[PDB]
Design a binder for this molecule. Structure first.
Ligand SMILES: [Fe+2]
Ligand SMILES: [Fe+2]
Ligand SMILES: [Fe+2]
Ligand SMILES: [Fe+2]
Lengths: 298, 298, 298, 298
């Protein structure tokens, strides 16, 4: 009944069996769990926060100079209330790290993001193995399924944003389930603003400090033949706090072939991960014959 | 073997049967035909041209003032070669004409577009009836199928554009078939730059003056159970000329139910026109369960 | 020492002289004053609020559908935290009201904005007359100076926005003085977030309900030969509240000739209002000879 | 009377004096000259062309995939005539080369741009010395004036563009003089489309192959106390050809102090180059007191 909050270090000790049973239960009945004692140092997370926030502040300062100047163009005084406070960019890590070639980051920043990205990779694969165990599969199974030819895709979206101006503005807002593998979310403050649908109703992720919030995608549901369902959610920015998010995605390689583990077995489909995303981006129906085939299906 | 060029007025005379046989043949074996003597006055088309071109010239003059000024911002001299010469906007006509409320047109312009849009509607419905006849269907059949509840959607895209900088830039460019009903294309100059794929190869639409180029969409293929195929094409702007296009679309109403005429009967599907477009815009797979169903299909 | 809060209705009564003396004092020593009892009904302001907020909510709902869909394009899940919550548009009123032809407002909205704009015009001209009186000028003087040929320019910027994500983000943010005539600001809630520089330090506009905040521009400083200085300010969106602003500007007509009243007399310049703005938009130096003349000046 | 076309290699020979006299005459009476035999190999220019064109073609292919996909979003078929064929980016070279960190260039491309940028720098400084000589100044004088503290700013704008859709669209288009030092323009084909105003009328730059077109900016006019005037021009893309431009700018360092050479001496002003550009970008009047000072000047 309570949202799973899990002290990962307990898997090294006498409490392991009960921690694995929480992980199992979250996987089966929540789709989500919040990790503490997960092995990424407080100091590293605090540095990632500070520096991301430093870069945000800079791009905001620059962005106001530019608003003032374009607005002057149209014979218009730009106010600070005209600001767009949302800023988001990505960083690839696997198979090829583009961290070196993304515009406008300090070197000291890129190296911090590098290290942090290696740490979370390592954490992800550990999590996948513990899922394997609970699941009766072999160590490495999911990392292997996710491998494809060149490897799993892994990146981190880095967001900075203001609070929602009022909750009823979210009233009518569609949620989703994530299409990929396993997602690890790192935020600032105490309140995420992250919510999951459970039995028709919205449950808040409980505020923690130095936590990582883990959730399973569509792909893990297929490989488990539905045993672990990817779950609907949303994330709304609270006046309370959490103005920054790092959402890192450990997804199957583009060419990877996804399908329910034979041991774990209606039957979920088999398919190449990239075709799941091409369905997703709307690039599987820009021809006529596909389209006619789909309307015959409905 | 020759692209169909059809003098529509001949349907009023002793030559009708041979003109209907061209229309039939184009419908079956070209998907396209070029109309002359189609009953829209030379004077009306020439006014539509002039005025569209007048409005283009204005939005270009304005657009250079703004480029000069934003470029100055970044300590940069804007050249005329920095110009974006492409300009396109739409006009609705049916079920509700938004021609009155589109920004930045002269009144004298809106009224010309109104009249012109009534004329082409009338021409479209005539064309659909002549298709009915060739097809063995009743007068009004297609207009009726297209009606839905509120009526057929009808609008005109108005484009102005420079020439392609070089043909091999189009080399690797995907074509398409139109998703809607029947399309009537009005251009300037002599060379369209419009091409259709016929038996694997690119055929140019032959240059004519005061012509209208007609082509059938995906919807007419379904209602004819494949007898009239919608055909692949593209349109590339020629150094030769044709720098302006008015493409008017007479499509089924959103809620209209499309399906192969029982008389005209594998079997094509039945479906609501709006679901064909939602497939098209990529809004039918932004949930997980649809997506899993589609991968099981492949 | 206290920010001027002025009950306008008191100019109809035994307290007039003391209210005029507040207006005089604010004009001379604050540049700003907050009006209550100003003669625009509570019901009208409350309707303007509600309806603006209704339109905001709609454009936000629509804006999230579009973010979800474009983000899907790039194989990316749009979150609600990716939202851009800032929305701003204008409405002209004088010399020609474009309220009828601005995209996407209910009719019931346009009529409310019309009425409201007539009311504030009337309030502005009253304020200018009371300035005349305090100043020793004739009734109508400033309205007349502002008239030019076709009339004074009058419009309203309508803004909706989230809170600033954190105050130190404003830390390093340039303020300004308004370039025009007289500005009347209508907000929601209680806290504006509006601040004025007075003797080197930031003073908050005091929270009021159904207030209008008035401030004088650069133009009124010139006509008063510096007696009424236009004052520096800024406006920052508070977590506390005030998520909406209507800032209406009563400025001199484009062709109006601005210059210190002979009675009110270094000497401020004389000039056409439009040249002050062209200086402002950076369109007075896009040629070489101007530029050389300015560097010789410095 | 004829546009100056100058074989630079002749400065190494018996013809030097007559070539220097052409350079002198162009500097005094044309502001522009076209260089051939200028010492940048045919092979290097041809490689720069090919590779720029290869990169253009790629960004165009990518840009059409994205248009098709966003247009589908709005239930709209993207045509090739909807294309925006204009593409432009910059490359810094001095004081710090950002060529390594600009997005989406082949390595083999960056190295070609590096070399090419060193070659043109070397050519620029040579040209400045020959100007010194004609002028009676010492070798290095202008390079030294341009040096400031960190060095001269040097970069190259790289443009690719379609033809102007029709000449009367340029009819009403403002020209300019360049604000910087000395500009070297490298194009493809034969016809630039570049024109200079000379005695009130438009003169075309004569078509040449493997030419470089040189022109003097506002800064060189000041240092020569008007002896060498920077001249008005424009560049329009011809159906004839020249679809690519590399415009490289050798300007004074930001902090450089520009002023008429004492030997060369109304008197032109003295000033820091960056203040000339800040005048230019419209950032010298975003405060009130500047503005009042300027209106008193007029
Ligand atoms: Fe998500
Ligand atoms: Fe088409
Ligand atoms: Fe202001
Ligand atoms: Fe130029």
């Amino acid at each position: 009944e309570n949202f799973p909050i899990i002290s990962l270090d307990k898997v090294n000790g006498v409490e392991r069996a009960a921690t694995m049973e929480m992980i199992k239960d979250a996987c089966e009945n929540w789709g989500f769990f919040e990790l503490v004692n997960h092995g990424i140092p407080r100091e590293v997370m605090d540095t990632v926060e500070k520096m991301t926030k430093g870069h945000y502040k800079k791009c905001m300062e620059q962005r106001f100079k530019e608003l003032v100047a374009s607005k002057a163009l149209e014979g218009v005084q730009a106010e600070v209330t005209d600001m767009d406070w949302e800023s988001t960019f990505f960083l690839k890590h696997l198979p090829i790290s583009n961290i070196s070639e993304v515009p406008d980051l300090d070197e000291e920043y890129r190296e911090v993001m590098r290290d942090f990205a290696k740490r979370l990779e390592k954490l992800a694969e550990e999590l996948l193995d513990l899922l394997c165990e609970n699941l009766g599969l072999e160590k490495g199974y999911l990392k292997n399924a996710f491998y494809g030819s060149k490897g799993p895709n892994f990146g981190t979206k880095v967001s900075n944003y203001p609070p929602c101006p009022k909750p009823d503005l979210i009233k009518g807002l569609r949620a989703h389930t994530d299409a990929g593998g396993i997602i690890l979310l790192f935020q600032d403050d105490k309140v995420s603003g992250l919510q999951l649908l459970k039995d028709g109703q919205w449950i808040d992720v409980p505020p923690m400090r130095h936590s990582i919030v883990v959730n399973l995608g569509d792909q893990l549901e297929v490989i488990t033949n539905g045993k672990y369902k990817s779950v609907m959610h949303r994330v709304i920015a609270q006046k309370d706090g959490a103005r920054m998010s790092l959402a890192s995605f450990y997804n199957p390689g583009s060419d990877a072939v996804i399908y329910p583990a034979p041991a774990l077995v209606q039957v979920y489909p088999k398919f190449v991960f990239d075709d799941y995303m091409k369905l997703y981006a709307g690039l599987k129906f820009q021809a006529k014959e596909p389209r006619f085939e789909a309307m015959k299906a409905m």
